[PDB]
Amino acid sequence: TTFVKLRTKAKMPLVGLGTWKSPPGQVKEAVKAAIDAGYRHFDCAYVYQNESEVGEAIQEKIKEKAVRREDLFIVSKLWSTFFEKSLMKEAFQKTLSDLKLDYLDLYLIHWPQGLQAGKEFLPKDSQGKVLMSKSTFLDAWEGMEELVDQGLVKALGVSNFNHFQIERLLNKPGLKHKPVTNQVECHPYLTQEKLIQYCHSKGIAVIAYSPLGSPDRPYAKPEDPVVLEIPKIKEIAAKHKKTIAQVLIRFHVQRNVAVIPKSVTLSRIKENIQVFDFQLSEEDMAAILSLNRNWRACGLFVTSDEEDFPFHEEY
């Protein structure tokens, strides 16, 4: 299978194109190339500020008859400065207008902590301390549910949520639309076994980002573990006549976890979806899963002492 069926029975393609850090002058071509290589799932966000260029790409391929709207799975995300409901509606309409779409397939809460509204994405006081808001992810969810009832969003999900936080959402008084995905960092050094088990058992599909360990991240350090250099992955890649990246991506697909590798490089965009023509052995999967060290590269870490930080819990 190339998809995972969500609680709603909508089909989410297991491989999607990631866009975080794709420059605005390069992302239009990457998305065009992806569509031509058969990608149908596209992950974008308000805070990536490249949604307009993604939307141009999608519109051009629809107009060319290369792909039908109903066969695309477009995801975007609400940024934490926009949890308040009126602000949420303006942010969403901008994300929908930029993408030139009539509806999103999936709209996610980007992070679970709310951040102070204003122009900046990461508001700070004079000390350089990040400023939080009074709006919670619960508060934001109530706003987002209206979008579903309106037909503007097919389904809602979460990103960077721990299982306690999802429980809280699932137990929210008056809940109307249950979350359909949790999108979180996932690779052999952060396997997510317990979180994936919990989501799957709760009607929620998982979406794994940073499958290649995000080597273009801005704060990479020499002392960080290097996903793309794991020695067992080269071994397994060679045996399957695949690349190291293809093994790292397959690792998710084979767990029925969707995965959104980001590239703006034509050869790599093509390579990354070439993962439905081989199968990792039980020993291969057992060996990859062995590598877990609970090591994360991604997240808003400066807010670790504020309420609703996700990464202190085991999962």
| 310 sits near ligand NAP (criterion: CB under 6 A) | no
Q: Pick from 212, 230, 273, 288: which binds ligand NAP (CB under 6 A)?
A: 212
Selected from 245, 247, 257, 258, the binder of ligand NAP by CB under 6 A is 245
Phi, psi of 145 (to 5 degrees): -60, -35
98 part of the interface to ligand NAP, by CB under 6 A: no
Which residues inside 247-266 make contact with ligand NAP, applying CB under 6 A?
A: 260-265
Question: How many residues bind ligand NAP, per CB under 6 A?
Answer: 29
Q: Is 213 in the site for ligand NAP (CB under 6 A)?
A: yes
Q: In 3D, which of 96, 196, 100 has the Cα closest to residue 147? A: 96
216 makes contact with ligand NAP (CB under 6 A):
yes
The single residue among 50, 76, 183, 192 that binds ligand NAP, judged by CB under 6 A, is 183
DSSP calls for 230-255: -HHHHHHHHHHT--HHHHHHHHHHTT
191's tokens:
């396997």
d(CA 296, CA 294): 7
Provide the CA 102 distance to its chain's centre, in angstroms: 21
Structure tokens at 160: 């960077």
Q: Interface with ligand NAP includes 298 (CB under 6 A)? A: yes
| 188 lies in the site for ligand NAP, by CB under 6 A | no
48 catalytic residue (yes or no): yes
Helix (H) or strand (E) holding 106: strand 106-109
* Residues lying near ligand NAP in the complex (CB under 6 A): 18-21, 43, 110, 159-160, 183, 209-216, 243, 245, 260-265, 268, 271-272, 298
